Design an enzyme around this catalytic site. Sequence first.
Site, PDB file in Angstrom:
ATOM      1  CB  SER A   1       9.296 -40.692  85.483  1.00 28.39           C
ATOM      2  OG  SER A   1       9.344 -39.388  86.110  1.00 28.39           O
ATOM      3  CG  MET A   2       6.489 -36.426  82.020  1.00 28.30           C
ATOM      4  SD  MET A   2       5.825 -35.710  83.538  1.00 28.30           S
ATOM      5  CE  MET A   2       4.487 -34.724  82.873  1.00 28.30           C
TER       6      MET A   2
ATOM      7  CG  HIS B   1       9.767 -41.633  90.235  1.00 33.32           C
ATOM      8  ND1 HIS B   1      10.432 -42.644  89.576  1.00 33.32           N
ATOM      9  CD2 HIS B   1       9.987 -40.505  89.516  1.00 33.32           C
ATOM     10  CE1 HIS B   1      11.031 -42.150  88.509  1.00 33.32           C
ATOM     11  NE2 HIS B   1      10.773 -40.856  88.448  1.00 33.32           N
TER      12      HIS B   1
ATOM     13  N   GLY C   1      11.314 -37.470  81.362  1.00 29.08           N
ATOM     14  CA  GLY C   1      12.113 -36.287  81.034  1.00 29.08           C
ATOM     15  C   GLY C   1      11.619 -35.030  81.728  1.00 29.08           C
TER      16      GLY C   1
ATOM     17  CG  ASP D   1      12.486 -44.696  92.152  1.00 23.72           C
ATOM     18  OD1 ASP D   1      11.944 -43.580  91.985  1.00 23.72           O
ATOM     19  OD2 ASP D   1      13.702 -44.892  91.941  1.00 23.72           O
TER      20      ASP D   1
HETATM   21  C1  LIG Z   1      10.145 -38.543  85.442  1.00 20.93           C
HETATM   22  O1  LIG Z   1      10.251 -38.555  84.227  1.00 20.93           O
HETATM   23  C2  LIG Z   1      10.823 -37.463  86.244  1.00 20.93           C
HETATM   24  C3  LIG Z   1      12.344 -37.566  86.043  1.00 20.93           C
HETATM   25  C4  LIG Z   1      12.781 -37.587  84.578  1.00 20.93           C
HETATM   26  C5  LIG Z   1      12.812 -38.891  86.606  1.00 20.93           C
HETATM   27  C6  LIG Z   1      10.261 -36.118  85.810  1.00 20.93           C
HETATM   28  O2  LIG Z   1       8.933 -36.052  86.231  1.00 20.93           O
HETATM   29  C7  LIG Z   1      10.971 -35.004  86.507  1.00 20.93           C
HETATM   30  O3  LIG Z   1      10.776 -34.814  87.687  1.00 20.93           O
HETATM   31  N1  LIG Z   1      11.717 -34.244  85.722  1.00 20.93           N
HETATM   32  C8  LIG Z   1      12.488 -33.128  86.231  1.00 20.93           C
HETATM   33  C9  LIG Z   1      11.787 -31.833  85.981  1.00 20.93           C
HETATM   34  O4  LIG Z   1      11.270 -31.578  84.911  1.00 20.93           O
HETATM   35  N2  LIG Z   1      11.852 -30.976  86.957  1.00 20.93           N
HETATM   36  C10 LIG Z   1      11.228 -29.679  86.820  1.00 20.93           C
HETATM   37  C11 LIG Z   1      12.310 -28.630  86.748  1.00 20.93           C
HETATM   38  O5  LIG Z   1      13.381 -28.870  87.330  1.00 20.93           O
HETATM   39  O6  LIG Z   1      12.050 -27.611  86.090  1.00 20.93           O
HETATM   40  C12 LIG Z   1      10.375 -29.417  88.020  1.00 20.93           C
HETATM   41  C13 LIG Z   1       9.691 -28.039  87.872  1.00 20.93           C
HETATM   42  C14 LIG Z   1       9.299 -30.493  88.089  1.00 20.93           C
HETATM   43  C15 LIG Z   1       8.409 -30.245  89.307  1.00 20.93           C
HETATM   44  C16 LIG Z   1      13.756 -33.037  85.434  1.00 20.93           C
HETATM   45  C17 LIG Z   1      14.565 -34.315  85.590  1.00 20.93           C
HETATM   46  C18 LIG Z   1      14.563 -31.871  85.973  1.00 20.93           C
END
Ligand SMILES: *C(=O)[C@@H](C(C)C)[C@@H](O)C(=O)N[C@H](C(=O)N[C@H](C(=O)O)[C@@H](C)CC)C(C)C
Lengths: 192, 184, 187, 189, 188, 189, 190, 188, 188
Positions: free
Chosen positions: D94-95, D119, D65, D168
């Site tokens: 992921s997280m 990833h 998430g 991935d």
């Molecule tokens: C794994 O859980 C990733 C996704 C859910 C597949 C998670 O790590 C991820 O990248 N989440 C993304 C996120 O929190 N992005 C933030 C944001 O947009 O504020 C970045 C600052 C992260 C470097 C979500 C899906 C936007």
Amino acid sequence: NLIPTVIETTNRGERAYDIYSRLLKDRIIMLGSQIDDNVANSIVSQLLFLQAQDSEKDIYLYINSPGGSVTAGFAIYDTIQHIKPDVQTICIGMAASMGSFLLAAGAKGKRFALPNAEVMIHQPLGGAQGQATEIEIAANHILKTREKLNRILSERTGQSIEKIQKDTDRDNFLTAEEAKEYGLIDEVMVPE
Amino acid sequence: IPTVIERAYDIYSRLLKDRIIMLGSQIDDNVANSIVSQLLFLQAQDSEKDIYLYINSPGGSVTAGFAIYDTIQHIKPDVQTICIGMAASMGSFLLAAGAKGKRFALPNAEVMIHQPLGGAQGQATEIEIAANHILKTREKLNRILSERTGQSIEKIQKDTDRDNFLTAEEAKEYGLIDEVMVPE
Amino acid sequence: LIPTVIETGERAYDIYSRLLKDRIIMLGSQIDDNVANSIVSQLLFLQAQDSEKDIYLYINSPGGSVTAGFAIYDTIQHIKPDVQTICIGMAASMGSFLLAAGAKGKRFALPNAEVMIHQPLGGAQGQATEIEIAANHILKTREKLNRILSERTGQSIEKIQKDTDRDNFLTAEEAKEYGLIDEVMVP
Amino acid sequence: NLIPTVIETGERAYDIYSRLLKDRIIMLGSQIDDNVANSIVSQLLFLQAQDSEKDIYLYINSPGGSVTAGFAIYDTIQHIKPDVQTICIGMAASMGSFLLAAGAKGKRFALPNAEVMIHQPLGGAQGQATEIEIAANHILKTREKLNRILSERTGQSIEKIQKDTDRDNFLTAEEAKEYGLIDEVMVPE
Amino acid sequence: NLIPTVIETAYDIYSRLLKDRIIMLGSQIDDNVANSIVSQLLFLQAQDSEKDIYLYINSPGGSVTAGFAIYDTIQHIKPDVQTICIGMAASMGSFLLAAGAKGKRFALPNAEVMIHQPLGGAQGQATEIEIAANHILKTREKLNRILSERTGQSIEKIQKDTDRDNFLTAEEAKEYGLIDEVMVPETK
Amino acid sequence: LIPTVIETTGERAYDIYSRLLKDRIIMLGSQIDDNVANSIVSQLLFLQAQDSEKDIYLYINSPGGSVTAGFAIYDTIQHIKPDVQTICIGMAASMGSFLLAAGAKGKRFALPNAEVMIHQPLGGAQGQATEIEIAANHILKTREKLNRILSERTGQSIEKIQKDTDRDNFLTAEEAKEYGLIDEVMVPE
Amino acid sequence: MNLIPTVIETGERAYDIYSRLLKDRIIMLGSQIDDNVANSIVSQLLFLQAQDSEKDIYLYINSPGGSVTAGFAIYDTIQHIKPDVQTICIGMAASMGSFLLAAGAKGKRFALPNAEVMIHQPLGGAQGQATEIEIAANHILKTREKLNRILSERTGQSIEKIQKDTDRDNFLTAEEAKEYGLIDEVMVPE
Amino acid sequence: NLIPTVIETERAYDIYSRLLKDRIIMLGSQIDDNVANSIVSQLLFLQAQDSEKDIYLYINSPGGSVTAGFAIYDTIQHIKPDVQTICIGMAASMGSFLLAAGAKGKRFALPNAEVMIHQPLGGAQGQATEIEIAANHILKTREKLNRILSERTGQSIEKIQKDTDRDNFLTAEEAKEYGLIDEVMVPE
Amino acid sequence: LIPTVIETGERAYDIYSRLLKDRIIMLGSQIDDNVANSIVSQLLFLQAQDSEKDIYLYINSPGGSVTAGFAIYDTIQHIKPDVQTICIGMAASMGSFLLAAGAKGKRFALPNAEVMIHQPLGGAQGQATEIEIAANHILKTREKLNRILSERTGQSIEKIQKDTDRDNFLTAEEAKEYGLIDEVMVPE
Ligand SMILES: *C(=O)[C@@H](C(C)C)[C@@H](O)C(=O)N[C@H](C(=O)N[C@H](C(=O)O)[C@@H](C)CC)C(C)C
Ligand SMILES: *C(=O)[C@@H](C(C)C)[C@@H](O)C(=O)N[C@H](C(=O)N[C@H](C(=O)O)[C@@H](C)CC)C(C)C
Ligand SMILES: *C(=O)[C@@H](C(C)C)[C@@H](O)C(=O)N[C@H](C(=O)N[C@H](C(=O)O)[C@@H](C)CC)C(C)C
Ligand SMILES: *C(=O)[C@@H](C(C)C)[C@@H](O)C(=O)N[C@H](C(=O)N[C@H](C(=O)O)[C@@H](C)CC)C(C)C
Ligand SMILES: *C(=O)[C@@H](C(C)C)[C@@H](O)C(=O)N[C@H](C(=O)N[C@H](C(=O)O)[C@@H](C)CC)C(C)C
Ligand SMILES: *C(=O)[C@@H](C(C)C)[C@@H](O)C(=O)N[C@H](C(=O)N[C@H](C(=O)O)[C@@H](C)CC)C(C)C
Ligand SMILES: *C(=O)[C@@H](C(C)C)[C@@H](O)C(=O)N[C@H](C(=O)N[C@H](C(=O)O)[C@@H](C)CC)C(C)C
Ligand SMILES: *C(=O)[C@@H](C(C)C)[C@@H](O)C(=O)N[C@H](C(=O)N[C@H](C(=O)O)[C@@H](C)CC)C(C)C
Ligand SMILES: *C(=O)[C@@H](C(C)C)[C@@H](O)C(=O)N[C@H](C(=O)N[C@H](C(=O)O)[C@@H](C)CC)C(C)C
């Protein structure tokens, strides 16, 4: 819907004409819609064409419009003032917002309205979203534009900028006779 | 839309050549734009010969009707109004606008008249202006109808309060038309 | 989907309510009038229970309504108890503002918690008069936001203005240097 | 259907997750948002307040998430005095995989057919070039933080984490143990 | 207080059956359902580690990983888990039905069993799709490996049989080695 | 809104349906799906656990639904020790009419103005020629199973059931008695 | 047919008003700039060069801009072709439209007295992985640098000043645009 | 102002068809079968008109279908006349592929035009067998694409693969060094 | 937007009419009743114009209605002129079927054109009796399709069924070896 074609005999064949195109030959431009870039592009092109055919004879612009873009109205306005021929402006139905502005923009002494045609004037509208820096810039721009709109209206009507400012705060509706008194038109067209 | 050749003409264009304008659609700024153009075009062709305008409309924009109305009264040729189907609201107004002595409705055509409609949304100051503008427009609308028909302003007001359906004979009695067209 | 605990008569607390008994408030959502209404109620109730003991406010918020944020800020400053502010996850926008609002010497961020500060946003639609009023209100609100941050961080308004013009992301150590927090919590 | 109720004898009823919370068991079986992080953090704080010595068991079956929501959970785990045991069932991606690695050292577990995925983080950038540049630096800086913490907790080099999480990457329970994500593949007791 | 008893949506009928160590599955197997089933398995082991658990399956399947979470908890826990099939056990349900304690997997006379290969989805770049295809193939290989151990069938046979949708009757399912016995009505 | 009743033991609240369950009455008033079937089966299994000797009353007012969900209810009815009485109110149709016939013999009722409807099962198939063939073979084999059981319980032949269920057949209470779907038509006491 | 049907605005089978102006080597840009609009404008420029490489071309611009690449397709063609392209601003030239206004033949770039010129930095969208966002951010930053570089050459303004003035939306009058170097003369009615 | 009209003093042309008369074909759209069909017919038409004179193809395309690009590509390579490719604005994806497809020595890009190269994208939804087939097809199609790109630029297939893993933006000078074009078109 | 060609009175042709004048038919879309009608009408027209001279059919089609394709197929065979089929870009499903249906010795595919063959798809919804009738029709129609393809390619029906069970992607060379096309078009 559908617009009729008028066909007439020329020197070298039979020409099918669009009804507006047919009117265009007699130096008549019909503005019967809201004013956007496409409508402004059309009107300007008609004005530039009519000057090219004859730079001496008058051009008749019929205005029934609720207005639209201010910049699109200014594209039309500046073209009217720049071209050599006098542009006669005739209000029928309703000339409001930018339409009222373009009606007053016609050749002085040659701006008419029909007996039951209505004229309305009001201050311009805008939008602004995002950051406070972005909103301030948008706010200063709409206020600067309004100053230019009021200033040109002052020149055309003969009324002061302060009166224009006061009378456009909220929507203002006028009769053909009340528009003549205000200086937006010169004479109310009488039946012939 | 069918085509006829002489010069290939569509059916509405063919009737325009014989000074006939067809108004079967709802009256908006686009329609009003076209009618005015046709009226001004026919005057330029011949300023003496009459023009025939068939009316089959439920009306539309009040100002758009006025663009057509003021053009009818302004031009030199006499404009005859012919009601087919239904002339309601601003369409009935335009039917009454025809040259006096030349307004007809067909035997089974219907004529409906009523007061104008509007919209007012926002601040109390803005609503009052919209309310006063519609009330003044109606007075003007009632005043014009009074002159076209011979009916009193106060009578026109009372009759247009609700939807008023009139027959071809009733419309003649009201003074909206002059005769009822006889099959010949 | 949120768990229930029973403390032994026997009465049932949901997980957040249980922490409120130990004077802990969880803000972990966008700040709107509803959330502000709930948070203020918890602040007023906890003061009424005990006036002397400290209150711990956990912040994991993207922010939200400015006025709703100010409803919480004023209640925090008004009540007698010290309100400790702990940043976990992210304290962005109005969350960073409320984070800096805690009792001085008692404002915390966790080691990997992030802090974002930027200028406020608005929306104006209608006549030129309406837009002028709206723009003046948004600009004046920014002045209010900037001078309160100046008071709480020690930074000058000229620096706050310059550094909040665009989105500004700060680490827990960077926030401490800036003066938004006092200490970074260590295991 | 639903999520069942259990009665202990006046008479008191628990939902099945609340009954497990009694024995210091936390279930993370959904996407990790601010609400989920908020609930999970509170349960960790409540369990520590009840007893600060005894272990906490956190089951992980999450697709992931918000990165900040995961870091709220991560930072709470390291802060508290009790050791947090991580158990992977189904899928930790992921997280969710990041939080599985966050567990007490020597006490990270996965079940034999449980899958682990790693990833790079996703993001969004819109508007002006200056606005895009700022957002790009933040996602880049946050990725370096995620990679740095993953390197520290698994024993892989930062450069290897960068290379392995570019696309991935799917891992079996044995492969996750070999990667240093979990300590042992939990085998039937 | 006394907890109010209800049929659905409070003390529901399933909670009352859970007291007698019976877990009801009558829906798609997703992360919400997997999580709840797992919690019930862990709760029932904590109550008693010797007494058998009864799991009724009427599922069309769902998430493969959700199924494995239920699957692995079944294998790990000390108590025997009996699987009873009513209506239809399809896909991951039929896989979970075969997962029950050996000698203690049942289906009812008109219960249906379906076995087939797993489904998936892949969108984006050619590298992205290659990884997705490699992951789905490896997951299918794992599914057949486990089924082979449970059924007694060879991996090669399982691949052939689950290539398309394969509908099996209760008696056919016993022949396959998916279930141990068919619960005939004539038993008291 | 489903009204509840309170009774003294201490004080316990029941919803109207679970209060009727105390007197061994199961209400089927909805379209049969996998959720509905899961609830009914649980009620049938709970009632057997309470008392193996005493009868169960199942009121049926249903248009039917999923065949497999109907079979889950059907198979459970046949497996349990208690006799299941089936009472038809309103309309027992499709899968509900099949379940009406599934009652303990001599204990299947329909009320004077209750309707019974029987017909062949519906289905869907969208894909390749191989995929349609399997789905078409599955539906046809399922219809045989439905007709074979209907033939056994009513007394009619398989060929007659096949011909009567080809189109929608609407039956009255007296007709359902003569056909063999029920034994008696209930009379006002 | 012996003669083609005449229409103002407008399948198309007629002689519209824009085509009549195109006979006198006038191109009307009165919309947002996309690949369809860019294609037609480029085609008009190439056709007009073929008819007469010596005579001037008049481009009227009332545009809010659009695609940067679509704007560059128009831009490169203007510079490549032998005939001089006079650019006239009416109403508004914003974003890529103001850029194209600067692109006209030097000494032959005009604006009407109440026409507006607006300049600001380019906009973009990027959704996906951190690696993919990095590429998009680098691409937009390079494109801004290219845009600022060309504007510097065209207006005579320094690259540093262009960067500062385009950070936020910048509204200019016809006189202010002339002082900036975006146009040459304000086409005063007198 | 739409796609205006040109009158030959009457003979009426839309602006693009007038340019087609002078052997100029405009491609400024997403490439799909309708677009591909129009380009191919134009190329075959111009070949039938005259077999010696050059054909000029302007490219302002973000890309499109891969097979539709190949339909255009294969028609170009087969016909007798030399086809010159001119890049204006953007030649991305297949647009860049078709840009390299032009007659060698006669591939141009304007000074501020942009060229972009990347691996193709796909979709695979359904069974694991179907996904494997779909993955194999797009990986084989990518192999075909790099192979032709390698042959027309002088770059190694290993290099092309590495350079097309993610979105790769090239300037007009940068495209020339790569071998995608021959010369940057210079003002006259 | 399709360009107009004017040949000298003076005639106005759209680009597809001008190529139709030279006995060339373009098929670059999904095959439906409207497309098939237009294709068939063109074939009848060209036979009426000149019975002896060969017709050229360019195919860039992903497939469509089976019955609509048969209207084209049956008309191709019935008419006196030899119909040359050239696969451009991609001929899939019925497009591939129509490609092999050309005059023997006169069926081509360009070097990078693709041909894809697979079994037909169908939709069946309603009563069990209605499903059986629909299912039999799909099965009869598939058998009809496989037999004609067997005759045209020279491959056995057994091999056709095996190769079309799933999506099968063939290169221009592989299409030639299969017998779907006689020869691959070589650049001039
Ligand atoms: C794994 O859980 C990733 C996704 C859910 C597949 C998670 O790590 C991820 O990248 N989440 C993304 C996120 O929190 N992005 C933030 C944001 O947009 O504020 C970045 C600052 C992260 C470097 C979500 C899906 C936007
Ligand atoms: C009259 O026609 C007005 C419209 C009917 C509302 C018109 O004069 C007007 O103000 N239009 C507004 C407009 O063009 N605003 C532009 C803009 O915001 O871009 C500038 C004038 C703002 C300074 C429309 C409704 C936005
Ligand atoms: C008859 O045709 C009337 C209706 C369509 C039934 C027509 O006369 C009418 O009332 N039109 C209304 C109209 O023009 N309203 C304007 C307006 O608010 O814009 C008022 C100014 C008229 C007094 C339409 C339905 C709004
Ligand atoms: C941080 O949380 C800010 C945004 C959520 C990013 C928040 O501070 C903010 O600007 N909220 C805005 C707001 O409350 N605007 C009001 C308003 O126009 O009603 C202005 C008066 C604030 C100056 C929301 C996003 C509108
Ligand atoms: C039976 O239960 C199957 C489906 C209901 C048809 C189930 O086994 C299945 O195929 N589930 C699929 C699934 O888990 N897909 C994941 C995924 O796409 O991530 C693959 C990893 C499974 C190998 C659902 C239907 C997507
Ligand atoms: C009566 O209730 C029937 C339906 C309501 C029409 C019921 O008997 C029925 O036919 N249900 C259909 C059904 O379950 N079909 C399954 C299926 O397609 O999976 C077939 C296996 C039954 C032979 C529902 C409506 C799909
Ligand atoms: C002015 O015309 C700008 C906007 C339309 C207001 C125009 O300059 C612009 O920013 N266009 C953007 C654009 O072309 N972006 C591309 C892209 O991200 O695809 C960038 C590569 C440009 C550097 C449009 C609005 C996306
Ligand atoms: C550049 O033009 C690419 C995209 C449009 C950005 C283009 O090359 C591409 O990848 N097109 C994809 C395509 O045609 N895919 C086919 C297909 O799905 O049949 C694959 C076989 C290609 C390996 C489109 C975007 C689907
Ligand atoms: C190839 O073109 C196939 C599809 C379009 C991909 C085509 O061969 C095909 O299967 N067409 C299907 C079809 O027409 N099915 C009919 C039908 O259901 O009416 C069957 C009778 C064919 C056996 C389309 C996709 C419905």
